[PDB]
């Protein structure tokens, strides 16, 4: 009764955890607590096997631990700056090579899987700082330029016509812009990691830069030059929808250095580079 | 048109909202999905896999594989202590384990924990060890006698190299905070010598032990949050 | 969400409009209505009653 399915969605009780059953004292030659970690399998012993448990009816649910929930929250992935200082024509537009590698918070979550396939919801938060006192009427244009399409080189480049590319025009004082994007890869899943090159020579590139080309985000202040200078900062947020992930992996332990690479820095006293806190000795809690 | 009443909240952007929005690439058809081995659907699948505890993470060990091993050897005094750690899933020696890292993305936890130990001495080395769990409301045990009054497993080393101790969920409240917060501090795991570490002549007089941790069938995490086990102090550049 | 088109007139306040609005005192239960003689439902009931014409309304 799917309706029953709907009620479970509303209460977040789709995936229930099992109950603890009552157990008793035992004396046998089946020793569940004993095993061999060498096998590469986790011992499957439960509390009822080691202690004498009572019967407890588990109410906990695992909905929130789903991959959909874990990766389904908007996080900042970029902060775009259009700062008008001394030349409107040169400073009223910019571009960004799209990627989910610049902000540690969301990059780390996605990188807990080797491959992930998902649709994206992009939300933009623009804020206009009145450096001289007035913002006038700010209208912005954010254009998605897929790899190959012409990239604008001036604030009036013909590419801003957007004859085929997707552009979102936002007007100051209206709700934050937002749109969805379907799974964009030429493969079946996005590579979070890639142990490969784009050639077989000492100068070939290594890593996800070979596979994760997403294009460019070109943006500009549509409004023409105003007397008062403004600094417009547009923060881009991303959220994964309808997610699937494969082959889980260890979380990033040290800080990120660059995009598309697992490269890291190591100082002279390494314990400062990882979250591991030095213990005084084996017996000091 | 239809009379409407715009409600508070309209126009805002909540990072955790669940709305629909127009698609920037209409008519686009995504690449067909192929089968890839290893699909994960719920993070609980990762909490149920054992990972090593950097239990010997003293300062001189961090940065070495030896931060993962506890050394055992022939004792001259009886019932000596081997190690002692807090049992809290996101507390310190176990914060960097996989279950500790995932638990660090959630605010609450519940359920039983499974600690396993694998002896790595020679096949001719014997040993009996007492692994104990001390429920809260008391200090960590100071002797094997004090420790064995709590939940415990007497492990006899033999053909099967590994043993498991289950820390049952024994709490006042149905959940506890994952972060180090007294009220919901779960107790301790201590290890002591039950007999001794005996070896025949011409055999190494010391041996290591590896420690693992994972969650039982009742393990569960709640209230997603950002982690404090990783940070960014500058721009990540091209 | 549902795509909508805000029409002219939206947001204005017409003193003779007929809309609904949230109630400032939720859960409040009004005093029971008792019977009172003399109820009027339409002003025509008052136009049908004779009243005197100040026909000799000269200034004096």
């Amino acid at each position: 009764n799917p309706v029953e399915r709907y009620v479970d969605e509303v209460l977040n009780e789709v995936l229930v955890v099992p109950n603890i059953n009552q157990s008793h004292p035992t004396t046998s030659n089946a020793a569940p607590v004993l095993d061999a970690a060498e096998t590469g399998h986790t011992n499957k012993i439960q509390p009822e096997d080691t202690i004498e448990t009572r019967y407890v009816q588990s109410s906990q649910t695992l909905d929130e631990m789903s991959v959909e929930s874990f990766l389904g929250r908007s996080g900042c992935i970029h902060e775009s700056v259009l700062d008008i200082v001394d030349n409107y024509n040169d400073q009223s537009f910019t571009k960004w090579n799209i990627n989910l590698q610049e902000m540690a918070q969301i990059r780390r979550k996605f990188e807990m899987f080797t491959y992930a396939r998902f649709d994206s919801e992009i939300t933009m938060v623009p804020s206009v700082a009145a450096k001289d006192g007035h913002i006038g009427h700010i209208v912005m244009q954010y254009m998605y330029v897929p790899p190959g399409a012409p990239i604008p080189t001036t604030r009036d480049d013909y590419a801003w016509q957007s004859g085929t590319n997707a552009s979102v025009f936002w007007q100051h004082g209206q709700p934050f812009p937002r749109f969805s994007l379907p799974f964009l890869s030429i493969a079946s899943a996005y590579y979070m990691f890639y142990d490969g090159y784009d050639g077989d020579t000492y100068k070939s590139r290594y890593g996800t830069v070979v596979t994760n080309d997403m294009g460019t985000l070109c943006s500009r202040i549509v409004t023409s030059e105003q007397l008062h200078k403004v600094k417009v900062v547009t923060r881009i947020y991303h959220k994964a929808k309808h997610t699937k992930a494969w082959c889980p992996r260890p979380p990033r332990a040290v800080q990120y250095s660059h995009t598309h690479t697992t490269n890291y820095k190591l100082s002279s006293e390494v314990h400062n580079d990882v979250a591991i806190r030095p213990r005084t000795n084996l017996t000091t809690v | 048109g239809l009379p409407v009443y715009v409600t508070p909240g309209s126009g805002q952007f909540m990072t955790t909202d669940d709305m629909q929005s127009p698609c920037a690439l209409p008519w686009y058809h995504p690449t067909k999905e192929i089968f890839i081995p290893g699909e994960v659907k719920n993070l609980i699948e990762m909490c149920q896999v054992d990972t090593l505890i950097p239990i010997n993470s003293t300062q001189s060990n961090i940065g070495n594989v030896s931060m993962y091993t506890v050394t055992l050897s022939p004792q001259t005094k009886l019932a000596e202590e081997i190690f002692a750690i807090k049992v809290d899933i996101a507390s310190h020696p176990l914060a960097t384990t996989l279950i500790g890292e995932i638990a660090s993305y959630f605010t609450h936890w519940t359920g039983s924990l499974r600690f396993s130990f694998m002896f790595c001495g020679t096949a001719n080395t014997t040993l009996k060890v007492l692994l104990a769990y001390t429920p809260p409301g008391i200090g960590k045990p100071r002797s094997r006698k004090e420790a064995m009054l709590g939940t415990h497993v007497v492990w006899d080393v033999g053909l099967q190299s590994t043993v498991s101790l289950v820390v049952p969920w024994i709490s006042a409240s149905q959940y506890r905070f994952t972060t180090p917060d007294t009220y919901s501090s779960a107790g301790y795991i201590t290890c002591w010598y039950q007999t001794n570490f005996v070896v025949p002549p011409n055999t190494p007089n010391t041996a290591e032990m590896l420690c693992f941790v994972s969650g039982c069938k009742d393990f569960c995490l709640r209230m997603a949050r950002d982690t404090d086990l990783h940070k960014q102090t500058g721009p990540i550049t091209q | 969400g549902l795509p909508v088109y805000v029409t002219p007139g939206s947001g204005q306040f017409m003193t003779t409009d007929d809309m609904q609005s949230p109630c400032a005192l939720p859960w409040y239960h009004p005093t029971k209505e008792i019977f009172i003689p003399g109820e009027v439902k339409n002003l025509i009931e008052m136009c049908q009653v004779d009243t005197l014409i100040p026909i000799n309304s000269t200034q004096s």
């Binding site: 969605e9 789709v14 909905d63 379907p182 309808h242 | 698609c23 | -």
Partner: peptide, 29 residues
């Protein structure tokens, strides 16, 4: 267009745009 269901507690599960990428979070399990 959307999937009306009945038992009476209807669950009008609407999808307002014509692309699959446009809908909200997925059902679990």
């Amino acid at each position: 267009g959307a999937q009306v269901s009945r038992q009476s507690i209807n669950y009008f599960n609407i999808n307002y745009f014509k692309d699959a990428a446009s809908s909200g979070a997925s059902r679990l399990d």
